[PDB]
Design a protein around this ligand. Structure first.
Ligand SMILES: [Cl-]
Ligand SMILES: [Cu+2]
Ligand SMILES: [Cu+2]
Length: 477
């Protein structure tokens, strides 16, 4: 009972779209996979860690010839790996060294909003700075940072801003996991881009239904290679693309083990020979290369396209061994006096809507009490023939899946999730408990759909501990 299918509906994959373009071989030689260094703290006082993160412009050598003008956090493209630990408090200085407004959103982080959350209510102006403070109150997980200024998010991510973020805790520490960063533990941020005289040009490539790129850009590198020197490797996959889905597998269908989802370690490790990710989903995977011989090249693909080359070195054979259960996920329970909240995604291209509306920065579409678990029922009304899979995301929480069209959820969806692909004609039920007060967004994570307005806000409140929010209209740009 290894999983041997992608877990979304094939009738609706990206490649059914009339504008779809498959990935092509990028020019130049093979390069070692870039692995970002961890961000060093500025100061440590008690359980209080100080970081600084700066959005900035630079030049990154990507393709043969001229370098590519890009944006990055603390560097020219992407960002450093940022480590958080459950129970610690962080003071993070957010500097904007670009010439337009950004925000710093910690996708997957349980943090109050709408200011610390770094969605569209939290502009950092050009040359400006904002400071946030927060305590991490969720288990170990792979999460990420990216910008969120409505309606410029898609372009900003295109231009290069995204960083991988790791939360660790004692449980994950207790496991015997590959942990030599850049040697047997890798971030794998999957993106796709097109270039024009080696440069980015979002406006040229824009599609309102989701912008696709011609080349595969992995951690900001084209034609990547990994030298395998220890056989058990952890790969922290993130779909960081604006729209493209990634259907990941080894060329020979060599099995691997999913150990984690968006919001953490899964309750049991899942053996599979392939996995599909929609926008913003994460899968934390172990691969054991021990059955290959030194000098072999093992190729990870998406669809039939060569994605990363693994060069097998002088490799002493080893075995994985994971406990069962892998982790304890506490079940949320709902009050059973509480109704089901229904939200409906509909349309494609510029006709996308969320409950028949487009986002309004001043409109609070829904409310829900802090610490109360509620069932949400998320629907996509696109046709089975011709529709698309919309990745649905909620800020400020991790949720659990109950069912997909009344049947069992996918086998890698029994833990904590924050982004969920919703297939055409499908109805998915989740359980959602908000643990922090504030205003949070929920939306499609196809960036162009988000920017069109396939997005809504929810106010999370404590009765007799109320607060009034002074939501502003969007600045006139
Ligand atoms: Cl390759
Ligand atoms: Cu988010
Ligand atoms: Cu969408």
């Amino acid at each position: 009972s290894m999983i041997t299918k992608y877990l979304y509906d094939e009738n609706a994959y990206d490649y059914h779209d009339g504008g779809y373009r498959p990935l092509k071989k990028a020019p130049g030689e093979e390069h070692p996979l870039n692995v970002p260094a961890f961000l060093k703290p500025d100061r440590i006082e008690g359980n209080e860690i100080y970081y600084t993160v700066t959005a900035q412009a630079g030049e990154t050598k990507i393709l043969p010839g001229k370098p590519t003008h890009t944006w990055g956090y603390n560097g020219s493209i992407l960002g450093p790996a940022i480590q958080f630990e459950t129970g610690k408090t962080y003071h993070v200085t957010l500097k904007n060294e670009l010439d337009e407004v950004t925000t710093f959103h910690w996708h997957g982080l349980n943090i109050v909003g709408p200011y610390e959350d770094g969605g569209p209510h939290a502009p950092v102006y050009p040359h400006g700075e904002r400071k946030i403070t927060f305590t991490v109150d969720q288990p170990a997980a792979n999460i990420w940072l990216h910008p969120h200024p409505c309606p410029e998010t898609a372009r900003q991510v295109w231009n290069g801003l995204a960083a991988p973020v790791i939360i660790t805790d004692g449980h994950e520490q207790s496991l015997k996991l590959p942990r030599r960063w850049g040697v047997n533990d890798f971030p794998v941020v999957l993106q796709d881009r097109s270039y024009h005289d080696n440069q980015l040009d979002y406006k040229a490539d824009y599609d309102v239904d989701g912008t696709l790129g011609d080349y595969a850009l992995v951690n900001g590198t084209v034609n990547p290679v990994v030298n395998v020197t220890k056989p058990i490797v952890r790969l922290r996959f993130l779909n960081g693309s604006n729209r493209r889905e990634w259907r990941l597998h080894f060329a020979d269908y060599h099995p691997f083990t999913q150990i984690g989802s968006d919001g953490g370690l899964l309750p049991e490790a899942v053996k599979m020979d392939r996995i599909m990710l929609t926008c913003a989903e994460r899968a934390d995977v172990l691969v054991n290369f021990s059955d290959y011989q030194p000098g072999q090249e093992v190729i990870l693909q998406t669809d039939d396209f060569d994605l990363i080359k693994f060069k097998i070195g002088d490799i002493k054979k080893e075995n994985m061994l994971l406990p069962s259960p892998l982790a304890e996920i506490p079940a949320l329970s709902v009050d059973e006096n509480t109704p089901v909240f229904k939200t409906v995604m509909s349309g494609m291209d510029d006709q996308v809507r969320l409950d028949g509306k487009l986002f309004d920065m001043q409109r609070i579409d829904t409310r829900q009490q802090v610490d109360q678990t509620q069932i949400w029922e998320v629907s996509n009304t696109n046709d089975m023939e011709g529709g698309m899979i919309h990745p649905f995301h909620i800020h400020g929480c991790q949720f659990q899946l109950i069912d997909r069209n009344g049947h069992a959820v996918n086998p890698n969806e029994h833990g904590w999730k924050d982004t969920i692909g919703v297939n055409p004609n499908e109805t998915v039920r989740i359980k959602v408990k908000f643990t922090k007060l504030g205003i949070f967004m929920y939306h499609c994570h196809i960036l162009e759909h988000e920017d069109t307005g396939m997005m809504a806000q929810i106010e999370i409140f404590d009765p007799d501990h109320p607060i009034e929010y002074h939501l502003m209209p969007m600045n006139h740009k």
